[PDB]
Design a binder for this molecule. Structure first.
Ligand SMILES: Nc1ncc(Cl)nc1Cl
Length: 499
């Protein structure tokens, strides 16, 4: 549960840790933090340590000599159930996570902070059970837990519990001593402290530090620009809560419908296909999830494979989708990212029981718009227009350094969807359907709030990303994409304050 991730460990410290505190099968993961989107899996085996690279340029975690994964937590779960499935070039067993005591990626850790300022944040932002952990000021090396309990009529109060750090363990001046503030905090989360006159110091939710008023996005972005990385990693720590089942995707009958064997749709939000061919063993599966913002909904999906094109059009038809956003070229760096599932301009093709006419293509600077007509074969009166917005100039790796083109594209996709009465969800796809796809959907959700509520409204970027990540694994892949979400919204609000 993400304790195996050390966000501030050096390579030599990684080896030291595993040789002195670990055994054969011990492992941890770490950021190789001079080229963001590089990580290392460090693993003890035969009394030596081996370092395995994981690369993420924005579409998935690619473990050298292993598989592609939507999240580091999913990667670790996979190998901890599969001994012998990971091997070097000439097996490498992940057995025993080596736990990090670093508190820096916990939402509840504010580190740098004073008591009166911690009180004012809880007074303004906190509710009953809202808490944080801060460094002491009055006692170098110690920490303080501040908690809100109970109009400022005095019905609520803040309590400050001193946390002693003695000889590499933490305690509250009595009882158990813990190896980390996480362990302390987890324990008193489940076994709350009670003051002698009976107030239960329940730790219910950390204090929100991420929610901003969209009016002042420039201020946050400039503050995050000195940071974005610490906020992103805090968000990634919470991915361990999102290991929901994906058993439909793992079915042998569904294996060849997944572009990447281990990047699979959550059962609870998967798109279920009805009206399928009897003779097919399983005909209800596609690697797609419904994303509902928590109104315009989305389907996040992978690029079609040659054998899933028919399924893709079953899905568009059944869900009544009228707009498709394609975020990759068909081919990038010489590999297929999405097969061509639409006809050439003016042509008409049948895709199993579905029929598609390419009525007109219109080329813009950064994208092409294809006006497609979709109908079920043999059934007149089923025809509807589906608008495919195919963005063409996104970089092979990384993100654009200016969001002006994505924003223009997004505005036009939004206007098209809104113009169609009763349209169903907007289909959004890239290679695996998690990185680019996730990034586009999140920017679209945040920006819709500002479309409806105006510039003086509350947004919360990592809260929105967690909500969409509970509906499809690993939505928004990299810190680069996370920063891009911030820069896009900013660029949106800056053009709005203008006109
Ligand atoms: N192709 C794309 N990929 C990601 C995002 Cl956020 N936007 C676009 Cl247009």
């Amino acid at each position: 549960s993400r304790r195996w991730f050390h966000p501030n460990i050096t390579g030599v410290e990684a080896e030291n840790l595993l040789l002195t505190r670990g055994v054969d099968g011990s492992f941890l993961a770490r950021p190789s933090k001079s080229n963001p989107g590089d990580f290392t899996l460090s693993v003890r085996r035969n009394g030596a340590v081996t370092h395995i690279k994981i690369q993420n340029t924005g579409d998935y975690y690619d473990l050298y000599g292993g598989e592609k994964f939507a999240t580091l937590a999913e990667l670790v779960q996979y190998y901890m159930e599969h001994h012998g499935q990971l091997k070097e070039k000439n097996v490498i067993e992940l057995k025993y996570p080596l736990n990090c005591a670093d508190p820096t990626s916990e939402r509840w850790f504010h580190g740098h902070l004073s008591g009166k300022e911690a009180e004012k944040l809880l007074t303004e932002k906190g509710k009953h059970g809202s808490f944080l952990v801060r460094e002491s000021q009055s006692h170098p090396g110690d920490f303080v837990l501040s908690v809100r309990t109970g109009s400022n009529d005095g019905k609520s109060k803040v309590t400050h519990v001193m946390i002693r750090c003695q000889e590499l363990k933490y305690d509250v001046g009595g009882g158990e001593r813990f190896d980390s503030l996480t362990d302390l905090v987890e324990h008193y989360k489940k076994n709350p402290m009670v003051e002698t006159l009976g107030t239960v110091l329940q730790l219910k939710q950390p204090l929100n530090t991420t929610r901003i008023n969209a009016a002042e996005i420039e201020s946050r972005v400039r503050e995050l620009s000195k940071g974005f990385w610490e906020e992103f990693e805090t968000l990634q720590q919470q991915e361990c809560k999102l290991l929901y089942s994906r058993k439909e995707g793992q079915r042998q009958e569904n294996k060849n419908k997944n572009r990447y064997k281990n990047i699979l749709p959550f059962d609870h939000t998967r798109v279920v296909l009805h009206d399928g061919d009897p003779n097919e063993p399983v005909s209800d599966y596609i690697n797609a999830n419904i994303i509902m913002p928590e109104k315009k909904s989305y389907i996040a999906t992978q690029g079609c494979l040659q054998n899933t094109v028919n399924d893709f059009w079953r899905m568009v038809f059944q869900e009544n989708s009228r707009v498709i956003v394609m975020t990759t070229k068909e081919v990038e760096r010489g590999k297929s990212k999405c097969v061509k599932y639409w006809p050439d301009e003016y042509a008409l093709k049948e895709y199993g029981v579905m029929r598609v006419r390419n009525v007109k293509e219109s080329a813009a600077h950064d994208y092409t718009l294809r006006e497609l007509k979709l109908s079920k074969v043999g059934q007149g009166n089923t025809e509807r227009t589906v608008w495919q917005y195919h963005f063409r100039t996104w970089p092979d790796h990384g993100v654009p350094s200016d969001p002006g083109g994505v924003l223009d594209f997004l505005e036009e996709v939004h206007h098209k969807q809104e113009s169609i009465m009763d349209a169903g969800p907007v289909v959004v796809h890239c290679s695996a359907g998690i990185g680019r796809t996730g990034t586009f959907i999140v920017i679209d959700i945040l920006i819709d709030i500002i479309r409806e509520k105006g510039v003086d409204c509350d947004i919360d970027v990592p809260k929105t990303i967690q909500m969409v990540r509970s509906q499809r694994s690993g939505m928004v892949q990299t810190e680069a994409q996370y920063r891009f979400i911030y820069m896009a919204v900013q660029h949106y609000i800056e053009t709005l304050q203008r006109r």
